[PDB]
Structure 1
Amino acid sequence: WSPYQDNGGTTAAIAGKDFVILAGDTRLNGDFCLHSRHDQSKIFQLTPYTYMASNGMQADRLQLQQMLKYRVKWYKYNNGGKVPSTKAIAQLMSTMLYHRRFFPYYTFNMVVGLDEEGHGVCYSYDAVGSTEPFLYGTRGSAASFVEPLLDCLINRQHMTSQAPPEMTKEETLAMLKNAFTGAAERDIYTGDSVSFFIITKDGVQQESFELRKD
């Protein structure tokens, strides 16, 4: 009996200047079957402005999700009402993944949201608790399929062509739809639907998007 069970799936985030798009697939796959096609547990709201996408074992993503909520909910009381920033939660996630490093949460997290300026930001973790701020990122099955695509279409590193103007909220979403569609077609453990969360100043706006059923 193994206490760890990789429950699969893929999360992606892209940070523009105003917003963050945050995607996590809804396939929760067990051992050689699939349990659900509409698992929303991947992404979790901590505050209005800050979300935590989480891959690997579901049971640990769900423990961590609560554990994190009840250190956010404590922060709320001690710092008189005030909600923690993304940047605070981000270091809190790193601190809380590490306190459990001698029996890790088998969960590859991304804390995502807005900094104090309004500029969108995303942080990634490994099981143990290694914070790296990134601008576009992807953990999970389709890490390897999505993350090179984004690397080409955002950074344009190997192109003579002049870099494209900026990239709006709707283009960055359209890019991620295109990427995940090309990850469902080519990776086995990605599919069903993808829940997108478009965090802006205005409030979150989630729109689930359909993939290949297989």
Structure 2
Amino acid sequence: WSPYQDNGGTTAAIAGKDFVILAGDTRLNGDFCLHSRHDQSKIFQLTPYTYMASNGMQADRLQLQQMLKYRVKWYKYNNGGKVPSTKAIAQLMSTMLYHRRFFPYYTFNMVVGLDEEGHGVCYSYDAVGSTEPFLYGTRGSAASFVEPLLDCLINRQHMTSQAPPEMTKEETLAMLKNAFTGAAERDIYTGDSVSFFIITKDGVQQESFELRKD
């Protein structure tokens, strides 16, 4: 008997100049079996402008998510109503992961949102809180597939061809669909569907997107 279980799946985000897009696949896996093709537990709104995504053990992200949700309520009350910024929640999360150092949450988290200047950002974490800001991000079972592809299409460091324009939010979204789609094909623990959340100043669009069920 382990207190730890990997429930699999994959999150990815990409920041833009005035948006960030965040995605998680909805499969929740057990041992050698599949509990639900419709789990929305990976992505969790913290404030209107900040979300977290978590991979690993579904149980521990539920706990973590609630722990944060309450630190954020305390913060609101102790600061005359205002919500903590994405950067504050990002640092908060690092500190909470680390306070469990010893019996760690088995989550691989991302915090995403909008900075103060209104620019998208992503913080990715390891299990104890090492983070750093980045413009993109992917944790989970397909991470090691997706992450190099995003490297290639965003940064283009091995292309002579001059870098194309800044990616709009429609083009960014396509890019993550294409990369979730390829991952569902090849990582056996990712599939079913992807919930996308496009965070902007004007609110958060959701968008479901079917992946291949096998």
TM-score, with length taken from structure 1: 0.99
Q: Does 1:94 find its partner at 2:94?
A: yes
The corresponding residue for 1:53 is 53
Measure the CA separation in 2 of the matches of 1:9 and 1:157: 28
3-state secondary structure, aligned to 2:186: coil
- Note the C-alpha offset of 1:132: 1.2
Deviations 1:113-145 (A, max 9, x none): 001100110101111111111111110110111
What is the CA–CA distance in structure 1 between the aligned matches of 2:63 and 2:212, rounded to whole Å? 30
In the TM superposition, what whole-angstrom CA distance separates every residue of 1:19-67 from its partner, at most 9, and x where no partner exists?
0000000000010000000000000000000000000000000000000
Moved more, 126-135 or 101-110: 126-135
Query: What is the CA–CA distance in structure 1 between the aligned matches of 2:81 and 2:9, rounded to whole Å?
Result: 35
Deviation, 1:153, is: 0.6
- Percentage identity across aligned positions? 100
How far off is 1:147 after superposition?
Answer: 0.7
Q: Take 1:184 and 1:47, find their aligned partners in 2: how far apart are those partners?
A: 30
Q: 2: distance between equivalents of 1:126 and 1:166?
A: 29
- Is there any run of 5+ residues in structure 1 with no aligned partner, and where? none
Specify the SS of the correspondent of 1:159.
Answer: coil
Classify the secondary structure of the residue corresponding to 1:24.
strand
The SS at the match of 2:71 is helix
- Report the aligned-residue RMSD: 0.5
**What secondary structure sits across from 2:198 in the alignment?**
strand
- Extract structure 1 runs of 4+ deviating beyond 3 A: none
Distance 1:167 1:126 in 2: 28
Partner of 1:148: 148
Distance 1:104 1:7 in 2: 16
Aligned length: 214
The alpha-carbon deviation at position 212 of structure 1 amounts to 0.4
Counterpart Cα distance in 2 of 1:181 and 1:131 = 27
Q: 1:92-125 CA distances to partner (integer Å, 9 max, x unpaired)? A: 0000101111100000000000011001101011
SS at match of 1:46: strand
Secondary structure of residue in 1 paired with 2:34? coil
Give the secondary-structure state (helix, strand or coil) at the position aligned to 2:110: strand
Task: Tell me by how many angstroms 1:166 deviates.
Answer: 0.7
Q: Distance in 2 between matches of 1:132 and 1:115?
A: 14
Could you say what secondary structure the match of 2:151 adopts? helix
- Secondary structure at the counterpart of residue 2 of structure 2: coil
User: How far does residue 89 in structure 1 lie from its aligned partner after superposition?
Assistant: 0.3
Q: How does 1:142-181 map to 2 (within 5 A)?
A: 142-181=142-181
Tell me the distance in 2 between the aligned counterparts of 1:118 and 1:79.
21
